[PDB]
Amino acid sequence: WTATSGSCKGRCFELQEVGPPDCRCDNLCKSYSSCCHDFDELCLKTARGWECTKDRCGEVRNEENACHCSEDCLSRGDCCTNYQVVCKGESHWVDDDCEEIKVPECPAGFVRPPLIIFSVDGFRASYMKKGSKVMPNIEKLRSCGTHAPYMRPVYPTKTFPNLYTLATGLYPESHGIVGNSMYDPVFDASFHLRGREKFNHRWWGGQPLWITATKQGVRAGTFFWSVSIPHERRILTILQWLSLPDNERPSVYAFYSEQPDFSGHKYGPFGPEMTNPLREIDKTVGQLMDGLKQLRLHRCVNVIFVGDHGMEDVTCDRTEFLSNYLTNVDDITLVPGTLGRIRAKSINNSKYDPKTIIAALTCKKPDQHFKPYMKQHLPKRLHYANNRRIEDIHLLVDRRWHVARKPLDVYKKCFFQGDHGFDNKVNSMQTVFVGYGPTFKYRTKVPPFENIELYNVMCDLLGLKPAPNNGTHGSLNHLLRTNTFRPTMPDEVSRPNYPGIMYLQSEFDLGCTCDDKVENKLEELNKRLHTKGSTKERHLLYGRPAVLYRTSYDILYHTDFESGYSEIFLMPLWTSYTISKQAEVSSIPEHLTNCVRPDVRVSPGFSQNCLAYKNDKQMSYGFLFPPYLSSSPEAKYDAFLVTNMVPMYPAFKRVWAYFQRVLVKKYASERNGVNVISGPIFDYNYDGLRDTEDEIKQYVEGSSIPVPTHYYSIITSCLDFTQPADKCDGPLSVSSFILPHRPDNDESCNSSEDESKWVEELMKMHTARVRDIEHLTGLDFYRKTSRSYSEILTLKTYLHTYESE
Ligand SMILES: *[C@@H]1O[C@H](CO)[C@@H](O[C@@H]2O[C@H](CO)[C@@H](O[C@@H]3O[C@H](CO[C@H]4O[C@H](CO)[C@@H](O)[C@H](O[C@H]5O[C@H](CO)[C@@H](O)[C@H](O)[C@@H]5O[C@H]5O[C@H](CO)[C@@H](O)[C@H](O)[C@@H]5O)[C@@H]4O)[C@@H](O)[C@H](O[C@H]4O[C@H](CO)[C@@H](O)[C@H](O)[C@@H]4O[C@H]4O[C@H](CO)[C@@H](O)[C@H](O)[C@@H]4O)[C@@H]3O)[C@H](O)[C@H]2NC(C)=O)[C@H](O)[C@H]1NC(C)=O
Ligand SMILES: O=C(Cn1cnc2ccc(N3CCN(C[C@H]4CCOC4)CC3)cc2c1=O)NCc1ccc(Cl)c(Cl)c1
Ligand SMILES: [Ca+2]
Ligand SMILES: [Ca+2]
Ligand SMILES: [Cl-]
Ligand code: NA
Ligand code: NA
Ligand SMILES: [Zn+2]
Numbered sequence: 001w002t003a004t005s006g007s008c009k010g011r012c013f014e015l016q017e018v019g020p021p022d023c024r025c026d027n028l029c030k031s032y033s034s035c036c037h038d039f040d041e042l043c044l045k046t047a048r049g050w051e052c053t054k055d056r057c058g059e060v061r062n063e064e065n066a067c068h069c070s071e072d073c074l075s076r077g078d079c080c081t082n083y084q085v086v087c088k089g090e091s092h093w094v095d096d097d098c099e100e101i102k103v104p105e106c107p108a109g110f111v112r113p114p115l116i117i118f119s120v121d122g123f124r125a126s127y128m129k130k131g132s133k134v135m136p137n138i139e140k141l142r143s144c145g146t147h148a149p150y151m152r153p154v155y156p157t158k159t160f161p162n163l164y165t166l167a168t169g170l171y172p173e174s175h176g177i178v179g180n181s182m183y184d185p186v187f188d189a190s191f192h193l194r195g196r197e198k199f200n201h202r203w204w205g206g207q208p209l210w211i212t213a214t215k216q217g218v219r220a221g222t223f224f225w226s227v228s229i230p231h232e233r234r235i236l237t238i239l240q241w242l243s244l245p246d247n248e249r250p251s252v253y254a255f256y257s258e259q260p261d262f263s264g265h266k267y268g269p270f271g272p273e274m275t276n277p278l279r280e281i282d283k284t285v286g287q288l289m290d291g292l293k294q295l296r297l298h299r300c301v302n303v304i305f306v307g308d309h310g311m312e313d314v315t316c317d318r319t320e321f322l323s324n325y326l327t328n329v330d331d332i333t334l335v336p337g338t339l340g341r342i343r344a345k346s347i348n349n350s351k352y353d354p355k356t357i358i359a360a361l362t363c364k365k366p367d368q369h370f371k372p373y374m375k376q377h378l379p380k381r382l383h384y385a386n387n388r389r390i391e392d393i394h395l396l397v398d399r400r401w402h403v404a405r406k407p408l409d410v411y412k413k414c415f416f417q418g419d420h421g422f423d424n425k426v427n428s429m430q431t432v433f434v435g436y437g438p439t440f441k442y443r444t445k446v447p448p449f450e451n452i453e454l455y456n457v458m459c460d461l462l463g464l465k466p467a468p469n470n471g472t473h474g475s476l477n478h479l480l481r482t483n484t485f486r487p488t489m490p491d492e493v494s495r496p497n498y499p500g501i502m503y504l505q506s507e508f509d510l511g512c513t514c515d516d517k518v519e520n521k522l523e524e525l526n527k528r529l530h531t532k533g534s535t536k537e538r539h540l541l542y543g544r545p546a547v548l549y550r551t552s553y554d555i556l557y558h559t560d561f562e563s564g565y566s567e568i569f570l571m572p573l574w575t576s577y578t579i580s581k582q583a584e585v586s587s588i589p590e591h592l593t594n595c596v597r598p599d600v601r602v603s604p605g606f607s608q609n610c611l612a613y614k615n616d617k618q619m620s621y622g623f624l625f626p627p628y629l630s631s632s633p634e635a636k637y638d639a640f641l642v643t644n645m646v647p648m649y650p651a652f653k654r655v656w657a658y659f660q661r662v663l664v665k666k667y668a669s670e671r672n673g674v675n676v677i678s679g680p681i682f683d684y685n686y687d688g689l690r691d692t693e694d695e696i697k698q699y700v701e702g703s704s705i706p707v708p709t710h711y712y713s714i715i716t717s718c719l720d721f722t723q724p725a726d727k728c729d730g731p732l733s734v735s736s737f738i739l740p741h742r743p744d745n746d747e748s749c750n751s752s753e754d755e756s757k758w759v760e761e762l763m764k765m766h767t768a769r770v771r772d773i774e775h776l777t778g779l780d781f782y783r784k785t786s787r788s789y790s791e792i793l794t795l796k797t798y799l800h801t802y803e804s805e
Contacts, residue, residue: 001020001021002020002021002022002023002024002032002033002034003021003022003023004023004034004035004036004037005023005036005037006022006023006036006037007023007036007037007038007042008023008025008035008036008038008039008042008043009038009042011025011036012025012039012042012043013025013026013027013043013237013240013241014026015219015221015241015250020034023035023036023037024036025039025043026221027221027224027225027226027229027234027237028222028224028225028226029226030226030227030228030229031199031224031226031227032196032199044229044233045064045065045066046066047062047064047065047066048065048066049066050066050067050080050081050232050287051080051081051082051086052067052069052079052080052082052083052085052086052087053069053086054086054087056069056086056087057069057086057087058070058071058087061073066080066232066233066236067079067080067081067083067236068080068083069083069086069087074294076243077239077240077242077243077295078236078239078240078243079294081235081236081239081287081288081290081291081294082287082290083294084290084293084294085290090293092286092290093137093140093286093289093290093292093293093298094136094137094140094286094289098140098143098144100442100443101299101437101438101442102438103438104299104300104437104438104439105296105299105300105438106297106300107295107296107297107300109245109246110246110300111246111251112218112251112462112463113300113301113302113437113438113439113461114242114250114251114252114253114297114300114301114302115251115252115253115301115302115304115458115461115462116238116252116253116254116255116288116301116302116303116304117166117223117252117253117254117255117304117306117458118254118255118257118285118288118303118304118305118306119163119166119223119254119255119256119257119306119307119308120257120259120260120281120305120306120307120308120432121159121256121257121258121259121260121261121262121307121308122259122260122261122262122264122265122307122308122309122310122311122418122420123260123261123281123307123308123310123431123432124260124264124269124307124310124311124428124430124431124432125149125150125151125307125310125430125431125432126150126310126430127260127278127432128142128147128432130270131274131275131278134275134278134279134282135278135279135281135282135285136282136286137282137283137285137286137289138281138282138285138305138434141285141303141305141434141436142305142434143443144436144442144443145303145434145435145436145437145440145441145442145443145444146434146435146436146440146441146442146444146445146446146479147432147433147434147435147444147445147446148432148433148445148446148447148448148449149445149447149448150430150431150432150433150448151306151307151430151431151432151433151448151449151450151451152424152425152430152448152449152450152451152799153165153307153308153309153310153424153429153430153431153450153451154171154172154383154424154450154451154452155172155382155383155384155423155424156172156178156179156338156339156384156421156422156424157309157310157338157420157421157422157423157424157426157429158179158180158309158420158421159180159193159261159308159309160177160179160180160193161177161178161179161180162308162309162451163223163256163308164177164204164206164208165451165452166306166308166451166454166455167208167209167210167223167455168206168207168208168209168455168467168469169206169452169453169454169455169456169466169467169469169470169471170205170206170452170455170469170470171383171384171452171470171688172383172384172387173383173384173385173386173387173390173688174205174206174386174387174470175204175205175206176203176204176205176206176387176389177191177203177204178384178387178389178390179335179339179341179389180192180193181193181335182203182389183333183343183389184203184388184389185388185389186388187202191203206467206469207467208222208223209223209252209455209458209459210222210223210252212459212464212465212466212467213251213252213462213464216464216465218251218252218462218463218464219248219249219250219251219252220250220251220252220253221250222254223254223256224256225255225256227258231255231257231284232284232287234255234256235255235284235287235288235291236291238253238255238288238291239288239291239292239295241253242292242295242297243295251462252458252462255284255288257281257284259277259280259281260274260277260278260281260311261311261420262277263276263277264311264418265311265416265417265418265419266415266416266417266418267417267418268311268313268417268418269310269311269312269313269418269428271417271418285305288303289303299438300437300438301437302435302436302437302438302439302440302461303435303436303437304433304434304435304454304458305432305433305434305435305436306431306432306433306434306451306454307431307432307433308431309420309421309429309431310420310427310428310429310430310431311418311419311420311428312338312399312400312418312419312420312422312426312428312429313400313417313418313428314338314400314401314402314416314417314418314419315414315416315417316402316410316411316414316415316416317414318369318400318401318402319401319402319403319404319407319410320368320369320370320397320401320402320403320404321403321404321405321406321407322334322361322403322404322405322406323405323406323407324365325360325361325364326357326360326361327360329405329406330345331344331345331346331349331351331352332344332345332357332405333345334403334404334405335391336402336403336404336405336409337397337402337403337404337419337421338397338401338402338419338420338421338422339394339395339396339397339403339421339422340370340372340393340394340395340397340403341390341391341393341394341395342357342391342392342393342394342395343391343392343393354374354392354393357372357393358372358374358393361395362746363746363749368749369397369398369400369401369403370395370396370397370398370401370403371395371396371747372393372394372395373393373394373395373396373747374392374393374394375390375391375392375393375394375686376686376709377740377742377747378394378396379738379765379766379767379768380683380688380710380738380766380768380772380776381425381738381766381767381768381769381772381799382423382424383470383688383772385686385688386685386686386687386688396423397421397422398422399422399423399426399428402419425767425799425801425802425803426803427803427804430448431451433449433451433454435479438481438482439461439480439481439482439483440479440480440481441478441479441480441481442481444479446476446478446479447794447798449475449476449794449797450797450799452469452470452471453471453472453475453476453797454471454476455469455471456469456471456472456473456474456476456485457471457476457479457480460480460483460484460485461483463483472771472793472796472797473485473487474486474487474789474790474793475790475793475794475796475797476794477790477793478790478791478794484790486790487789487790487793488789489546489780489783489789490546490548490780491546491548492546492547492548492780493546493547493548493549493550494547494549494550494551494552494553496544496547496553496554496555496564497552497553497554497555498554498555499554499556499601499602500601501531501600501601502600502601502603503598503600503601503602503603503604504600505598505600507604508598508604508607509604509609510596510598510604510607510608510609510610510611510642511609511610511611511614512595512596512597512598512609512610512642513594513595513596513610514592514595514596514597514637514640515591515592515595516592516595516597516637516640527559527634530557530558530559531557531558531601532557533557533562534557535557535558535559535560536557536562538578538726539560539561539562539576539577539578539675540562540576541576541578541675541716541725541726542675542716542732542781542782542783542784542785543782543783543784543785544562544564544576544783545564545573545574545576545677545779545780545781545783546779546780546783547564547573547778547779548778548779548780549690549778551566551568552566552567552568553565553566553567553568553573554567554601554602556572556599556601556602556643558625558635558638558641559631559632559635559638560577560625560629560630560631560635560638560639561575561576561577561624561625561638561644562575562576562577563575563576563624563625563643563644565602565643567602567606568693569680569682569693569706570606570607570608570704570705570706571608571624571643571645571646571647571680571705572624572643572644572646572679572680573679573680573777573779574677574678574679574777574779575624575625575644575677575678575679576675576676576677577625577629577675577676578673578674578675578676578725578726579629579664579665579668579673579674579675579676580668580673580724580725580726581668581669581672581673581724583629583631583665583668585628585629585661585665586628586629586630586636587628588627588628589633589636592627592636592637592640595637595640596610596621596640596641596642596645597637597640597641597642598641598642599641599642599643601643602642602643607642607643608621608642608645608700608703608705609642609703610642611702612700612701612702612703612705613647613700615701615702616700616701616702617701618649618701618743619647619648619649619700619701619707620647620648620649620650620653621645621646621647621648622645622646622648622652622653622656622657623639623640623644623645623646623660624644624646624678624679625638625639625644625678626639626660626661626664627639627640628660628661629660629664629665646680646708646711647700647705647707647708648741649741649742649743651742651743651744651745652711652739652741652742652743654745654751654755654759655739655745655755655759655762655763656711656739657755658755658756658759659713659759659763662755662756663759663760663763664676664715667715667717668725671715671717671718671721671725671733672717672718672721672722672723672724672725673717673718673724673725673726674715674716674717674725675715675716675717675725675726676713676714676715676716677712677713677714677716677781678711678712678713678714679711679712679777680708680710680711680712681708681709681710681711681712681738681773681776681777682695682696682706682708682709683709683710683776684696684697684698684709688772688775688776689775689776690775690776690777690778693706707741708741709740709741710738710739710740710741710776711738711739711741712736712737712738712739712768712773712776712777713736713737714734714736714770714773714781715734715735715736716732716733716734717732717733717734718730718731718732718733719731719732719733721733729786731787731791731795732782732785732787732795734770734795734798734800735767735800736767736768736769736770736772736773736800737763737766737767737768738766738768738772738773738776739762739763739766740766745758745762747762748761748762764802767799767800767801767802768799769796769797769798769799770782770795770796770797770798771796771797774796781796782795782796
């Protein structure tokens with residue numbers, strides 16, 4: 001109930017919202033149907049429109065008008081945005097040359113440059129270039145400020161997940177808004193774009209920027225707007241708030257536009273009808289900037305122009321139907337469209353089996369346009385699993401396609417020509433970032449970056465301490481002229497042991513054999529030097545990784561590779577080696593095919609054993625440093641040490657062997673040498689974070705050898721590829737992957753073919769940031785480089801995407 005007979009007189013767009021059943025006058029009252037009776041009359045004036053004209057100049061103030069051209073309007077803070085242009089001979093902001101803003105030029109009483117966030121729904125990254133002729137105000141922001149060629153959204157590339165990620169710095173799995181529609185089984189409640197359930201605070205986790213500001217004594221209302229308030233009135237409201245007295249004035253403001261998304265859905269991303277919405281958004285930016293210029297704030301405010309996601313061509317005819325795959329289609333609930341989420345229609349149905357649904361959806365049709373996954377098997381880069389609102393069964397839908405339950409869903413809802421939601425690495429889903437103001441750099445282009453990083457920067461822009469989030473604070477320091485955040489490297493928690501030769505061969509009873517009993521004072525001292533670290537500067541290029549948790553581990557040196565060997569997990573946490581452009585690939589000699597050799601630096605009690613693998617009929621083993629890349633026949637014996645062995649399903653070993661035998665050498669030829677760090681990952685509870693020992697769900701049968709959920713590799717070389725990886729003077733270049741360690745290759749529909757036709761495609765799908773590997777392993781990489789730490793942070797957040805131009 002609302003007692004709507006209160007009044008908005010003197011309260012229009014009040015910042016504090018009032019409590020039921022008292023009527024409301026804030027920018028959200030329309031959404032709640034709770035505005036006072038006189039809200040439209042008082043607060044949503046439209047008389048005479050949005051622009052001054054010659055005849056209005058110096059008019060007698062008329063309180064009915066939408067905005068004013070009377071002489072008093074500047075002191076009132078309520079002139080039409082074009083007032084000074086029409087009436088006082090001034091120029092539009094867009095017509096002024098840009099001049100570097102070296103320092104904030106702010107009116108007295110301003111304690112800090114305000115931040116204005118201008119969010120545009122569905123603003124695809126390529127609009128910046130393709131629409132530049134019809135967006136002169138945005139083009140000036142972009143060219144004079146700091147811009148990225150594009151910004152990567154989070155998955156799913158839907159509105160609510162992305163806007164709330166912008167506000168919180170968190171992945172959707174952590175903030176809880178994991179789609180535009182959701183079912184929460186604990187609440188037993190549903191969330192929708194339409195309706196009131198979304199108003200309940202229990203859906204919305206983390207700490208959004210307006211709450212972070214408020215808690216720290218910086219004024220800020222929410223970033224939400226009722227859809228029916230026109231854009232011109234939103235801008236005028238922001239400009240009025242900026243005229244408040246110092247003690248009442250917010251320091252952060254948000255404008256939201258439903259366009260160009262609204263039209264993009266109807267017309268496709270590049271439909272001829274799309275020009276007008278782009279012109280209209282530009283006009284709104286022009287209004288704001290002209291309004292700031294009138295207030296003398298245009299060289300004081302930091303403005304962020306940012307999108308939530310892009311838009312792709314999608315039509316009704318490109319829909320796959322689950323009813324073409326499944327017999328039991330009525331026993332499932334599907335969340336449909338550009339991603340699929342499946343759960344049982346009834347929790348009382350005990351004949352429901354996820355295993356049978358997945359199999360019925362796996363590689364069934366030659367050109368199938370979606371792939372089913374258990375959520376824990378989704379690429380780790382999506383960070384889309386650790387939330388009860390994310391259904392166990394997920395369908396990744398190909399760009400340009402929809403998935404639906406049955407045909408009648410699609411014609412009893414062709415309307416639409418655009419949609420979004422797909423994998424956040426898809427080119428059409430990328431969106432925009434431009435920062436303009438005293439705190440941003442001048443005419444500066446920065447590399448693409450992820451939207452999860454912006455919360456930290458917005459906090460820096462406002463002098464706030466960010467709540468805990470998924471950005472990597474410092475990785476965007478290069479966007480900023482000042483207010484950089486100067487982080488320190490995390491402290492190593494566990495220091496390594498450096499074992500010498502401590503065990504005789506006969507102390508081992510591992511059930512392994514090797515044909516290595518074939519026997520030189522010259523070369524004898526040499527191999528001792530190698531075991532003591534003599535080649536470590538070659539294979540460990542950026543220092544040893546730091547272990548950021550409590551554990552017991554050993555550093556093991558070898559001619560061709562160095563490793564950090566876990567006495568708790570019985571295998572390396574990491575193995576580092578460098579492969580020059582000139583390296584040669586060789587085979588595993590016949591006599592060494594089943595060779596595993598005890599490591600006399602490491603006790604039998606802390607070693608794997610071969611008998612466990614003999615007995616485990618499902619499980620085989622592979623090596624972290626590949627024997628194929630040994631520097632010499634004698635160095636090759638080091639590759640067969642029991643301390644370089646890791647458990648691998650035979651189906652995985654097809655993937656791993658091709659990576660090690662073919663692809664490492666290919667990258668080293670292409671990149672002029674590579675340094676590789678490889679290792680296991682254990683993430684049995686799919687939270688994106690390193691498992692403790694007591695969280696391991698699977699062991700090699702009969703043993704304490706834990707089975708990894710994934711294997712990673714970090715592949716580093718010189719950004720200037722005229723320099724070899726091992727003698728690089730400048731910035732680095734990296735690509736990484738986190739490959740799922742799976743007992744079948746059902747994910748790769750072409751897996752019956754030669755690895756040359758499917759393995760690299762799998763690895764591209766499972767591309768990762770070094771930071772993702774850091775979270776999953778508790779390791780900290782690149783501790784010793786010649787580079788600034790902020791630059792290293794940017795490198796650790798890099799994702800190699802394998803998308804074209
Ligand atoms: C991305 O960044 C984020 C933010 O930094 C990272 O997420 C953090 O990860 C931490 C570790 O997983 C986690 O720390 C836990 O906090 C628990 C207290 O939780 C509440 O308070 C915080 C702080 O205000 C709040 O943010 C939480 O909000 C979550 O939950 C509500 C719903 O209740 C949601 O509205 C909200 O969206 C959010 O949900 C997400 O997180 C939860 C987990 O907290 C998930 O379950 C959801 O799926 C969703 O993703 C909470 O309201 C604290 O209780 C935990 O302590 C337990 O574990 C420790 C280990 O130190 C153990 O020693 C303790 O004994 C304790 O265990 C006890 O409870 C167990 C479970 O019942 C039981 O089994 C035991 O036997 C014990 O009794 C824990 O320290 C932190 O909450 C989140 N923060 C956020 C905002 O998500 C995230 O990891 C980053 N991602 C990556 C990939 O890096
Ligand atoms: O504004 C809109 C449409 N719209 C319109 N009216 C609404 C009315 C009420 C609410 N509630 C949400 C939960 N709220 C608690 C907050 C405070 C702490 O936790 C979240 C209470 C207010 C929402 C809306 C709403 O969304 N779309 C753009 C947009 C802009 C910014 C973001 Cl971050 C997002 Cl996700 C979307
Ligand atoms: Ca959107
Ligand atoms: Ca984990
Ligand atoms: Cl109303
Ligand atoms: Na076996
Ligand atoms: Na297959
Ligand atoms: Zn949309």
